Each structure stands twice: as structure tokens, then as C-alpha cells.
Structure 1
Amino acid sequence: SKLIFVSMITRHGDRAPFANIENANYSWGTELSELTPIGMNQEYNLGLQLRKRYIDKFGLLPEHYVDQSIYVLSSHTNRTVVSAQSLLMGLYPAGTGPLIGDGDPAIKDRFQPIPIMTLSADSRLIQFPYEQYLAVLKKYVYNSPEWQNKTKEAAPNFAKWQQILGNRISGLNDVITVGDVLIVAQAHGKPLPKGLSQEDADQIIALTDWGLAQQFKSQKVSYIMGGKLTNRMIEDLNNAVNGKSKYKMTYYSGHDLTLLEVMGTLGVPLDTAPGYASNLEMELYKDGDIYTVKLRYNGKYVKLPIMDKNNSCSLDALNKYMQSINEKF
């Protein structure tokens, strides 16, 4: 068997929070919501790892970029576009870019340009618009027994966390909000807010990770948000077989929700929220007339309920599996 195609999703890297803790004086080194230099580095390193895998090991892709060999699509945010740019700067690094004349660089240090298209901000393909996302949560998640139960467990801490942080804390949604700020603060080596113990910080962060993952343990919620992208990735695999497409890779640059919704849709919901620069790949293999698929998440293969001992299944089986999911929803 030989690898003949890959479809990939990433979450973007470390980024300055939109929210902030009122009773703290955190600054972020960039504008709110922007990818930080740390975030750029995370994605670049992922690019290097992908080069070692899909170029060096599998030889699916060549060492120098072939035009029209990779299709890249991003959500309409600076952080996802810059994350894709940064990753591609790892996959095809300085030194490998095009030459003109007598082996002179087209661009200083032989950077390799690779086009990235962006969805509109209104697109629901890669990230659900915030208002539509919350609408789904209010309808399907916030009133679920699981969410209600966890809320009751955590509720005794809300008053104190609010008095400490300043920020309103009146439910798990608010905990998730401050949780992102504490995650980035910790990543950047900032002190804890005055009066916030490390144990309390840990608990807030754990609830944040629990909450984001819990949202997508419903296959319904997942399909609502991710059925479209999941179908599209599988169609990409098919287009590689039926000759309709000549790409060796499609790459969707997105968010934690993007990974969560696709995994949730395929009936293999993540147990923990995706950290920065998390990624998943659908790999397609060919052996004569036999085509098989494998599914990789954060460096490990994932077993779909239709897969065999070796975490593989025919493309035909994957298509039938998706068809029924579509029929179900």
C-alpha cells in the first residue's frame, strides 16, 4: 500500500484572549484575538513535523512545492490565516522556495508562497458564527442533564471567583470565558490574580476543558456544526480516486470547535478539549484496486467503529458509514 492523499484540519496556535480578567493587569504582546509569536512557532513546528512525515517518510509530497498540489482553506480570522501561513512555512521552509534565472531566489531566503483561501465570516463550514454557536448551546447543551449537573457541582465557587476576578461568574459559560484567559496567562508565565489560588485556577481550567469537550459528546450537536466539513473531507478523498481532483492534500485551518465537531460527527468525540495547534488527518492508501483509510489525531491513529484491528477501513466502508450518519441526521 502507498499513501496517495491526505485531508487535514488544524486548530490555530496561542492567541491573545478577547476577554480579560478585571482584577488583573494582563497585557498580551499583541492585539486581542491575534496569534502571538508563540502561536506562530507552534504552527511552524507542526509544519516541520508534517514535512518529516508526508514528504520524507511517505513521499506523498515532494521536497519543493508543486503548484496545485495542496488546497488550503481558512476561516475568516487573522489567527487561522496566520496559523496556516506559519504551518506552511514549516512544511515548505526557507531554502526550498522557487528560483529564477541561474538558481537565484525568487524571494529573499527562498520563501515558498502557497496560496490560502479564506471563507467569509458568515460561513459555517469551519467555524460557526458566534451567535449561531451560542444558539446551538442554549438549545442543545446548557439545559442538558450533564451541563445542569456539572453546574450544580461548581456553583458553590461562583460567588468567590467573581469577587476575586471581578468578571461576572454566574454559570459554566462564564467559567469557560475566564478559563481561556487563565490558559493563556499561564502559557505566558504571568502571575495568578491576587487571591486566586493555584487549586482554584486549576479547577477553572479543568472545567473549561470539560465544558468544551462535553458540548460535542452529542453526535447531534456535532453534526449540526460539523456535518458539512466532515462530508467535504470524505468527498476530497473520493475525488482523489475518481480523478476529479489532482490535489495530494486538502488543509482546513480552523479552531478547537472545528476538530471537536468533526471528531464528534464521526462518532469518536474527543474526551479532552484540543490544545493549541492540535490537528487531525484523514489518510488515503492505494494497493492496486484496494483503497483504505486511516484517521490520525494529535499523532495517534483513531479507531472508527467500522475499522479493523489495524485502525483501517476501505474507502467504500467509510462512504457507507458517512451515508448513514447523514441519513440519521
Structure 2
Amino acid sequence: MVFAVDIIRHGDRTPIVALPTVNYQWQEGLGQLTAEGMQQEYKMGVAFRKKYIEELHLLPEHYEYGTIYVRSTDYARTLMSAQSLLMGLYPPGTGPSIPAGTSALPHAFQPIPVFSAPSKYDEVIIQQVDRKERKKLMEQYVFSTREWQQKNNELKDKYPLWSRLTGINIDTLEDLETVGHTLYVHQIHNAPMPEGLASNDIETIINSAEWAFMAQEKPQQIANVYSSKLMTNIADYLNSGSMKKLKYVLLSAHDTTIASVLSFLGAPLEKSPPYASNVNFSLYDNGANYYTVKITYNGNPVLIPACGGSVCELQQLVNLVHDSK
């Protein structure tokens, strides 16, 4: 293993939006990484150190300039996720000392830069898409399917009821997604639910929200629009990595990021990426200047139909990404 790229999802977080009908203030603020989420990312970093540094020696024991590049989206939760993980990757005890003295920072913490860009100006991770173009894509590839239509028809009679009880307007199946996600975070943190909302309905809304989310991520043509830039960059990192200084890239991102990438590669999800999810690209030098990339998702090889499995030859992956643009 001569090079690796990790995409991560952030750790456990508070809801993105409040339920208007529920009086409950999240101590951390809305949309924020929790203590539990920090520890998840830290633990992942600890595993990354054991794999990348202790076992494979891809990276050195102490942080070294020019060997790693870390990039996050423009959110507190992904920025803090990257800082938390890097605390595991390069833990207190490994940070620099001042010449002829003691450690630079308390407990010899190691600072590591996490670069970023606003979503509107991100040349690496996030692709901006006009609302009109997004709608066209969805109506062409998602809303127009029998499955989406049937699902909405079976549920829509309860949309006025749920709109009332949640305080969030639900006109279409897509609207159910934000509600279900909030209800889900409330559930697993044991927070108060909207009163009057029957428990089976909560199950239906959460499950429907997951289904609709995954259905929107499913079409490869949409993944091509949203993930082409990110995949182009990742291909370029790997390609550059195959040249006999940089050894590791970490991209701190979202569940959309991961689902769209897997869908891009022809392994679309039907179960939303858990917290601290990880898509990994590892580069291998098979001698004779022949390089391969194995792609893994939460520890399981990704079946990429284009490569007949989870191992692509390098230029095959570069061409695959280019062709889908």
C-alpha cells in the first residue's frame, strides 16, 4: 500500500432542524457533533493509526509536513470530526517539542491543519447544482418511478396529520425525509417526541425517510452530476500517488457524500451510511509499474460492476471516472 484516500462521515450529531411542536433545546446546539460523535471519530483515528502507521508504515510515527492532506466541508460537525479523528491518528504524546526544551503544547498535542472551502466555492468535495437542474434530474430519474409514486400514494393521506403534529409542512414524499431524520435523532437520543404522534407512524416516517433518501441517491446519472468532481479529484490523488511525498488524503464529509460515491461506482445503498462511515481507496504497487486500487466501505469490499469487483486497475479507475463526466 503506497497511498490511501478516506472519505468519512461525521460522528453522532444533534438534529439539523428542531421540531417546532416540541420544546427541547439541544445542549450542543442544532446540527452539531456530540461528545459521543467526537469519541467515534477519535476511535476511528486510533484504528487508522494502528493500520496506516503501526502496521503498514504508510505514514510516519509523528506528523510530518507534506505526507497528509486533510479537507473538510464548511460545517462545524465535519471540521470537528476531522480534528477529533486526527487526535487518534496523531495522539497527544506525539506532538513536537521546542528545541532544547519540553513539549510545544499541553500533553504534547499535535496540531494538524484541516483545510476547507464554502460549499459554493468548493473545488474538491461539494458540487453545487441549481435547484431547477436538481428538480429536472429527480423528476427524470426518481419521482417518475412506479416505486416512488406508489410509496407517496400510500402515505399522502396522512401528510396533513403529520404536518400538524410535527409542525413541518409535508406535501410530498421528499418532505418526509427531513422529518424522519429529526425524529430518528430524537429517538436514539431518547428526546421528547411530538405529542399525539402515534408510535407506528413514527416508525413509518423514519423508515420512509430512509427509503426516499436512498431512492434519491440511487440513480447513477444523479451520482454522476453530484460526485464527478469529487471522484475526479480522488482519481487524481491516487494517480499522483502512484508516482515514485503525499501518502494520505482524508476528506471529512456527509452521508450524502458517501451514498453518492457508492452510487457513482454502481453499488447504490438501500441502508443509510451510519455515523463515522468510511469509504476507503487504497493504492497498491504490484511491481512492474502496474498499480491497483481497492475500494472498501465500512470494512466491506465495494462491488464495482465496471471493475468486476472491488479492485480496479489504476488507469481503469481514472478512465471510469472520466467517462462518467
Q: Taking structure 1 as the reference length, what is the TM-score of the superposition?
A: 0.89
- Distance in 2 of aligned mates of 1:276 and 1:259: 11
Given that 2:81 and 2:252 are in contact with CA atoms closer than 8 Å, whether structure 1 keeps it comes out as yes
The equivalent residue for 2:135 is: 138
The equivalent residue for 1:104 is: 102
Partner SS, residue 317 of structure 2: helix
Give the 3 Å change call, closer, same or farther, for CA 323–169 of structure 1 in structure 2.
closer
* Aligned residue identity for 1:144: S
The equivalent residue for 1:186 is: 187
The equivalent position to 1:121 in structure 2, one of 100, 119, 138, is: 119
The equivalent residue for 2:14 is: 16
Given that 1:127 and 1:255 are in contact with CA atoms closer than 8 Å, whether structure 2 keeps it comes out as no
Residue 308 of structure 1 deviates from its aligned partner by 5.3
- Distance in 1 of aligned mates of 2:42 and 2:117: 22
Cα deviation 1:8-31 (Å, max 9, x = unaligned): 111122223232212212221122
Unaligned runs of 5+ in 1: none
* Aligned residue identity for 2:48: L
* Aligned residue identity for 1:313: C
Residue 134 of structure 1 deviates from its aligned partner by 4.8
Pairs within 5 Å for 1:270-309? 270-289=269-288, 290-307=290-307
Unaligned runs of 5+ in 2: none
Given that 1:43 and 1:277 are in contact with CA atoms closer than 8 Å, whether structure 2 keeps it comes out as yes
The equivalent residue for 1:249 is: 248
Give the 3 Å change call, closer, same or farther, for CA 256–20 of structure 1 in structure 2.
same
Residue 240 of structure 1 deviates from its aligned partner by 1.0
Given that 2:232 and 2:322 are in contact with CA atoms closer than 8 Å, whether structure 1 keeps it comes out as no
Percent identity (aligned): 39
- Distance in 2 of aligned mates of 1:222 and 1:268: 11
Residue 315 of structure 1 deviates from its aligned partner by 1.3
Please state if 1:154 is matched with 2:152.
no
Please state if 1:319 is matched with 2:313.
no
Give the 3 Å change call, closer, same or farther, for CA 223–194 of structure 1 in structure 2.
same
The equivalent residue for 1:40 is: 38
Over aligned residues, Cα RMSD in angstroms?
2.0
Residue 216 of structure 1 deviates from its aligned partner by 1.8
Residue 7 of structure 1 deviates from its aligned partner by 0.9
Q: Taking structure 2 as the reference length, what is the TM-score of the superposition?
A: 0.90
- Distance in 2 of aligned mates of 1:137 and 1:208: 19
Given that 1:306 and 1:317 are in contact with CA atoms closer than 8 Å, whether structure 2 keeps it comes out as no
- Distance in 1 of aligned mates of 2:306 and 2:176: 37
The equivalent residue for 1:53 is: 51
Residue 117 of structure 1 deviates from its aligned partner by 0.9
How many pairs were matched up? Answer: 319
Given that 1:4 and 1:248 are in contact with CA atoms closer than 8 Å, whether structure 2 keeps it comes out as yes
- Distance in 2 of aligned mates of 1:103 and 1:198: 62
Given that 1:127 and 1:257 are in contact with CA atoms closer than 8 Å, whether structure 2 keeps it comes out as no
Given that 2:242 and 2:285 are in contact with CA atoms closer than 8 Å, whether structure 1 keeps it comes out as no
- Distance in 1 of aligned mates of 2:203 and 2:95: 44
Cα deviation 1:180-203 (Å, max 9, x = unaligned): 211221232213322223322222
**Ranges of 4+ aligned residues in structure 1 off by more than 6 Å:** none
- Distance in 1 of aligned mates of 2:249 and 2:74: 17
